[PDB]
Design a protein around this ligand. Structure first.
Ligand code: ANP
Ligand code: MN
Length: 280
């Protein structure tokens, strides 16, 4: 698909840099015709077919295609897409409350109520995605944003659909790989992937929300990946002594090696606790 090739600067004014990635930079912007604000994600294109630098057209179009289909309170929306010789520019819904990653860094540890407040929104967003057979594949604190972090119960939106894929055949087999700390065993072992991988990531996020500690984190990437594959984690008493057994039960049913035995997004919403790259 070809995108708008007029100079983005003729329709938008950019400002503060919101975030960055290996092949992308995100900047706050303002559309001239409406005065409304957005987050412009500039993704670097590949200059040749056989190159490591930049993102392939196929990968950019996949992210755009997925974004165009979604509309839900807990997921980011796509406003427009521009492009030029060097970048494809996605004009995304702005989430100005910062990364959950930074919010957690400033508060250390949350209560189970604060944790479930965040988790319930994350689950609702993932429920929406999984309902459309969309696997996110990159769920982690830096890919979850707060609309306003100066509120007791911040609302969130899932962002970064750079690894997202449609799972119309139940599974995708293409070496998709994210951040060692959050990837599921099937990703580590390069096996067919499905919506189940996201549920594992949710388990890791929950563990972090409740303790401020990462379950599989090692001193090196290989150590982390080895820990993940062996499901090498435990609930340290120093961190979980005052955490309910139900909270641990929730986590335990997500951090399951066999994708088929892992809780599904629907299971997670009905669970008693809730129910009301990778290289050297
Ligand atoms: N809609 C948004 N609103 C506000 N900040 C955003 C938004 N989208 C992304 N960001 C910020 O920009 C950072 C990078 O964007 P993201 O879409 O996560 O790219 P990425 O896939 O990590 N990049 P790359 O490393 O090149 O693959 C995020 O981690 C956020 O801090
Ligand atoms: Mn990201």
């Amino acid at each position: 698909t070809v995108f708008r090739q007029e100079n983005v600067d003729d329709y938008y004014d950019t400002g503060e840099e919101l975030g960055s990635g290996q092949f992308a930079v995100v900047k706050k912007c303002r559309e001239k015709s409406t005065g409304l604000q957005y987050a412009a994600k500039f993704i670097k294109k590949r200059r040749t077919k056989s190159s490591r630098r930049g993102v392939s057209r196929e990968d950019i179009e996949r992210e755009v295609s997925i974004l165009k289909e979604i509309q839900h309170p807990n997921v980011i929306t796509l406003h427009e897409v521009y492009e030029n010789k060097t970048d494809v520019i996605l004009i995304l819904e702005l989430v100005a409350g910062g990364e959950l990653f930074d919010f957690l860094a400033e508060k250390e540890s949350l209560t189970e109520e604060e944790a479930t407040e965040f988790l319930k929104q994350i689950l609702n967003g993932v429920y929406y995605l999984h309902s459309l057979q969309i696997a996110h594949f990159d769920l982690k604190p830096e890919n979850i944003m707060l609309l306003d972090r100066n509120v007791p119960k911040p609302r969130i939106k899932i962002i970064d659909f750079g690894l997202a894929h449609k799972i119309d055949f139940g599974n995708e087999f293409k070496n998709i790989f994210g951040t060692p700390e959050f990837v599921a065993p099937e990703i580590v072992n390069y096996e067919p992937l499905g919506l189940e991988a996201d549920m594992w990531s949710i388990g890791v996020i929950t563990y972090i929300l409740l303790s401020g500690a990462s379950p599989f984190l090692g001193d090196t990437k290989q150590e982390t990946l080895a820990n993940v594959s062996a499901v090498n984690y435990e609930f340290e008493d120093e961190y979980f002594s005052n955490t309910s057994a139900l909270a641990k039960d929730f986590i335990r049913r997500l951090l399951v090696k066999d994708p088929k035995k892992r809780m599904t997004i629907q299971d997670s919403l009905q669970h008693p606790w809730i129910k009301p790259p990778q290289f050297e």
